[PDB]
Scaffold this active site. Structure first.
Site, PDB file in Angstrom:
ATOM      1  N   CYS A 132       3.904   1.177   9.519  1.00  0.00           N
ATOM      2  CA  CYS A 132       3.752  -0.288   8.966  1.00  0.00           C
ATOM      3  C   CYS A 132       5.486  -0.041   7.892  1.00  0.00           C
ATOM      4  O   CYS A 132       5.953   0.400   8.212  1.00  0.00           O
ATOM      5  CB  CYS A 132       3.644   0.845   7.759  1.00  0.00           C
ATOM      6  SG  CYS A 132       1.753   0.711   8.299  1.00  0.00           S
ATOM      7  N   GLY A 182       3.571   5.702  10.836  1.00  0.00           N
ATOM      8  CA  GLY A 182       4.779   5.227  10.382  1.00  0.00           C
ATOM      9  C   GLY A 182       5.389   4.147  10.289  1.00  0.00           C
ATOM     10  O   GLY A 182       6.296   4.034  10.183  1.00  0.00           O
ATOM     11  N   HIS A 193       0.707  -1.228   0.205  1.00  0.00           N
ATOM     12  CA  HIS A 193       0.389  -0.163  -0.257  1.00  0.00           C
ATOM     13  C   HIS A 193       0.839   1.637  -0.238  1.00  0.00           C
ATOM     14  O   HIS A 193      -0.005   2.173  -0.574  1.00  0.00           O
ATOM     15  CB  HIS A 193      -0.832   0.029   1.759  1.00  0.00           C
ATOM     16  CG  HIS A 193      -0.486   0.370   2.125  1.00  0.00           C
ATOM     17  ND1 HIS A 193      -0.349  -0.965   3.463  1.00  0.00           N
ATOM     18  CD2 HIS A 193       0.033   1.755   3.375  1.00  0.00           C
ATOM     19  CE1 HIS A 193       0.727  -0.639   4.393  1.00  0.00           C
ATOM     20  NE2 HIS A 193       0.545   0.739   4.456  1.00  0.00           N
TER      21      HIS A 193
HETATM   22  C1  LIG Z   1       0.863   1.955   8.219  1.00  0.00           C
HETATM   23  O1  LIG Z   1       2.139   3.195   8.993  1.00  0.00           O
HETATM   24  C2  LIG Z   1       0.826   2.808   7.267  1.00  0.00           C
HETATM   25  O2  LIG Z   1       1.274   2.427   6.024  1.00  0.00           O
HETATM   26  C3  LIG Z   1      -0.285   2.443   9.214  1.00  0.00           C
HETATM   27  C4  LIG Z   1       0.229   1.874  11.212  1.00  0.00           C
HETATM   28  C5  LIG Z   1      -0.898   2.503  11.630  1.00  0.00           C
HETATM   29  C6  LIG Z   1      -0.741   3.811  12.004  1.00  0.00           C
HETATM   30  C7  LIG Z   1      -1.583   4.040  13.701  1.00  0.00           C
HETATM   31  N1  LIG Z   1      -1.343   2.664  14.533  1.00  0.00           N
HETATM   32  C8  LIG Z   1      -0.928   1.855  13.149  1.00  0.00           C
HETATM   33  O3  LIG Z   1      -0.601   0.367  13.460  1.00  0.00           O
HETATM   34  N2  LIG Z   1      -1.617   1.095   8.807  1.00  0.00           N
HETATM   35  C9  LIG Z   1      -2.277   2.180   8.874  1.00  0.00           C
HETATM   36  O4  LIG Z   1      -2.626   3.174   8.471  1.00  0.00           O
HETATM   37  C10 LIG Z   1      -3.257   0.210   7.993  1.00  0.00           C
HETATM   38  C11 LIG Z   1      -3.740   0.774   6.183  1.00  0.00           C
HETATM   39  C12 LIG Z   1      -3.811  -0.158   5.165  1.00  0.00           C
HETATM   40  C13 LIG Z   1      -3.126  -1.556   5.618  1.00  0.00           C
HETATM   41  C14 LIG Z   1      -4.653   0.958   3.929  1.00  0.00           C
HETATM   42  N3  LIG Z   1      -4.754   0.614   8.354  1.00  0.00           N
HETATM   43  C15 LIG Z   1      -5.043   1.358   9.511  1.00  0.00           C
HETATM   44  O5  LIG Z   1      -4.555   0.762  10.533  1.00  0.00           O
HETATM   45  C16 LIG Z   1      -6.771   1.602  10.083  1.00  0.00           C
HETATM   46  C17 LIG Z   1      -7.792   1.828   8.823  1.00  0.00           C
HETATM   47  C18 LIG Z   1      -8.965   2.289   9.673  1.00  0.00           C
HETATM   48  C19 LIG Z   1     -10.077   2.212   9.623  1.00  0.00           C
HETATM   49  O6  LIG Z   1     -10.836   2.237   8.068  1.00  0.00           O
HETATM   50  C20 LIG Z   1     -10.377   3.564   7.409  1.00  0.00           C
HETATM   51  C21 LIG Z   1     -11.426   2.493  10.493  1.00  0.00           C
HETATM   52  C22 LIG Z   1     -10.581   1.698  12.108  1.00  0.00           C
HETATM   53  C23 LIG Z   1      -9.422   1.608  12.250  1.00  0.00           C
HETATM   54  C24 LIG Z   1      -8.624   1.567  11.096  1.00  0.00           C
HETATM   55  N4  LIG Z   1      -7.197   1.311  10.750  1.00  0.00           N
END
Ligand SMILES: *[C@@](O)(CO)[C@H](C[C@@H]1CCNC1=O)NC(=O)[C@H](CC(C)C)NC(=O)c1cc2c(OC)cccc2[nH]1
Ligand SMILES: *[C@@](O)(CO)[C@@H](C[C@@H]1CCNC1=O)NC(=O)[C@H](CC(C)C)NC(=O)c1cc2c(OC)cccc2[nH]1
Lengths: 304, 303
Positions: free
Chosen positions: A145, A143, A41
Site C-alpha cells: 500500500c 506492505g 488507513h
Molecule cells: C496494504 O499493504 C495495507 O496497508 C494492503 C495491500 C494488499 C496486501 C496483499 N496485497 C495487496 O494488494 N491493503 C489491504 O490489506 C487493504 C486494506 C484496507 C484498505 C483497510 N485490504 C485488502 O486488501 C483486503 C481486505 C479483504 C477482505 O476483507 C478482510 C476480504 C477479501 C479480500 C480483501 N482484501
C-alpha cells in the site's frame, strides 16, 4: 523492433518513495516537495480497519504520532490533513529529488507504470492498464500500500495511482493522488467485488494498427461503419464502447497507416463476429488490449 | 497476490547512461567511475560496418574524436581502449552516481532487466530472459545500442548485457560488459541467424506453479512421470531437458503448493501433447518460459 510490456524509467519516482508508520501500521508514501502522500488507513490498527471512522480516528492523532522515514532517516511531520482516502503530511524537509510532477486521474484503458514499493524501497516496476471495471491486474504483497502508478511525458511525472486494496479475485484497486478511489471501492477491510470486466476496444484497435505497421494486415476488410453501430455491436461481445477521445488518440496511427478509424472498427467487428479462422495477429490468436495507442507509437518510435 | 513480468527499479542505471558520438554515429554508453563503456562499432562508418577491422579503425582514432555527453554536460575523453566488442572511453571525471556494481555473465534461462535508452536517456524498462540460443526477445529500435541489462542484489547492480544487434528474425543479440557476445554473433553489418530456439523448461514449470498459486489449476492431472520419461517427451518438443538441480530449485514452489515437481511435469507433458485447446493460463495462450523459479518465488511467497 519487438513489442513488449514496457515501464517508464523509475528513477524519478524512486527518489520520492518513503515509509510512513503509525503505531505498528506501516506502508509507503510519496514525498514531493515538503508533503508526503499515503493511504489514510495507516492511522488504523488491525482492528480499526474493519469498520473505520477515519474522521474520528484522525482527530485522535497529532503530528508527533506519524513516523515518516526516507530510508532510516526520519522526516519530522509538522502538519497533517486528510483528503478523501489519502493522508497529506507536511514535513520539515523539501525533497531535493522532487521532479517536475502533476496529479492526474486516468481513464479506463489508459496504462501506467507501477513502482512496487515495500518499506519505502521500490522493488519492481511493471506496466498496468486500468481495466474498464476500475481494477488493475497488478502484483502486490503485504506492505505494498502506498505504491504509486505514474507516466512520464517529457520530464514531468504524472502520478495517477496509489495502491490500497486487493480484491478476492486477485486484482487490485486504489485511488488517484487526491484520494478518490477508481471504481466503487472503499478502504475497508471487507471483501469487495468489482463489476464484470470488458475488453478495452481502443487498445485492441491500436494493436491492430501495430500489426498493419508491421506488414500483418490480412484482417483488413473493405467495409466501414458508424461509431454508433460499432459500439452497439461491440457491447454484444463484452467490448467497451468507443468515445470521441478514443477516435482522436487513434489519429496518429490512422494517419501513419492511412486506415480510417471507422475502417479499422469495421475490420475489428468482422474479427469479433467471425473469429480468427485459425490465423494469428502479430504472432498471437488473442487480441491484445493492454497496449494504448501511445504505447504502440512509443514502441514503433522510441521516445524519451 | 498476482503475477506480472517485472523489472528492477532503474534509478541506479539511469544515473549511469550517457551519449557517445563518433563522427556520424551515436549510441548509448555506461558511465561507471572514470570509464564509459559502449559498443565498439560507434567508431565505424557506413562503409566500415560491413567488415570492420576494429583494431585498425581504433588506432586511427583520437580522444577528441569521441563526444561523450552526460545530460547538458560534455565529458572530456582522456583515454580509449577496447575489450572485445566493448569500447572503453576513459574520462577526466568520475560518475558521482556510480553505484555498487559488478560485471557478470548471465547463464541461459536466467532473466535480467533491460533499460532501453536512446541518446543516453532511458525511455523504458522491461524484463528479458537469456534464451538457450543466446538471443533475447526485446524491444529495441535505431539508436538503442549501448542499452544495458542488469539485476540488482541488495544495493549492488550486476550488469550482464549490452545491446548490439537485432537479428533478421526480430530477436536481439548483445554482449556482456566484457565485450563477449552471447551466442555465435559478430558485430558486423550482416544478416545473422541463431541456433534453434528451445524452450526453458524449468521456467515453464515455475510459471505453471505461479498459475496454481494464483488460482489456476485446470491443467493439473492425477498422473505422475519419471524425470527421464518427461525429458523424452520434452526434448521431442524442443524443450530443454530438466535436471535434478532444476527439480531442486523448484522445491519451494512445490512445497508451497503441495504439488510434486514430477506431478507438474506430468501436467506439462499433457499440455505439450494436447495443447491448451482454447484455454489460457495466467491470461496467456502460450506456455510462458521467461519467468525463473526465483521470479515466481519473489512474487508469490506468502500468497
Ligand atoms: C496494504 O499493504 C495495507 O496497508 C494492503 C495491500 C494488499 C496486501 C496483499 N496485497 C495487496 O494488494 N491493503 C489491504 O490489506 C487493504 C486494506 C484496507 C484498505 C483497510 N485490504 C485488502 O486488501 C483486503 C481486505 C479483504 C477482505 O476483507 C478482510 C476480504 C477479501 C479480500 C480483501 N482484501
Ligand atoms: C545499434 O543501435 C547500432 O548502433 C543496433 C540497432 C538495431 C537495429 C534496430 N534495432 C536494433 O536493435 N545495432 C545495429 O544496427 C547493428 C550494428 C552492428 C554492425 C552490430 N546491426 C544490426 O542490428 C543488423 C544488421 C543486419 C543485416 O545486415 C545489414 C541484415 C539483417 C538484420 C540486421 N541487423
Amino acid at each position: 523492433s519487438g513489442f513488449r510490456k514496457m515501464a517508464f524509467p523509475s528513477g524519478k519516482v524512486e527518489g520520492c518513495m518513503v515509509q510512513v508508520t503509525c503505531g505498528t501500521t506501516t506502508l509507503n508514501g510519496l514525498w514531493l516537495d515538503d508533503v508526503v502522500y499515503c493511504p489514510r488507513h495507516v492511522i488504523c490498527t488491525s482492528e480499526d480497519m474493519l469498520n473505520p471512522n477515519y474522521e474520528d480516528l484522525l482527530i485522535r492523532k497529532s503530528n508527533h504520532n506519524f513516523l515518516v522515514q526516507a530510508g532510516n532517516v526520519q522526516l519530522r511531520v509538522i502538519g497533517h490533513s486528510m483528503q478523501n482516502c489519502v493522508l497529506k503530511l507536511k514535513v520539515d524537509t523539501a525533497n531535493p529529488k522532487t521532479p517536475k510532477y502533476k496529479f492526474v486521474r486516468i481513464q479506463p484503458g489508459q496504462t501506467f507504470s507501477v513502482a512496487a514499493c515495500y518499506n519505502g524501497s521500490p522493488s519492481g516496476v511493471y506496466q498496468c492498464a486500468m481495466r474498464p471495471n476500475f481494477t488493475i491486474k497488478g502484483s502486490f504483497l503485504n506492505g505494498s500500500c502506498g505504491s504509486v502508478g505514474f507516466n512520464i511525458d517529457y520530464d514531468c511525472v504524472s502520478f495517477c495511482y496509489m495502491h490500497h486494496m486487493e480484491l478476492p479475485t486477485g486484482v487490485h484497486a486504489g485511488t488517484d493522488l487526491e484520494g478518490n478511489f477508481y471504481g466503487p471501492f472503499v478502504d475497508r477491510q471487507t471483501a469487495q467485488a468489482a463489476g464484470t470486466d470488458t475488453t478495452i476496444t481502443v487498445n485492441v484497435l491500436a494493436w491492430l494498427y501495430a500489426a498493419v505497421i508491421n506488414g500483418d494486415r490480412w484482417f483488413l476488410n473493405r467495409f466501414t461503419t458508424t461509431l454508433n453501430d460499432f459500439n452497439l455491436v461491440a457491447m454484444k461481445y463484452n467490448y467497451e464502447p468507443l468515445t470521441q477521445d478514443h477516435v482522436d488518440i487513434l489519429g496518429p496511427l490512422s494517419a501513419q497507416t492511412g486506415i480510417a478509424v471507422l475502417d479499422m472498427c469495421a475490420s475489428l467487428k468482422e474479427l469479433l463476429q467471425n473469429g480468427m479462422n485459425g490465423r494469428t495477429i502479430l504472432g498471437s490468436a488473442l487480441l491484445e488490449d493492454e497496449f494504448t495507442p501511445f504505447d504502440v507509437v512509443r514502441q514503433c518510435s522510441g521516445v524519451t
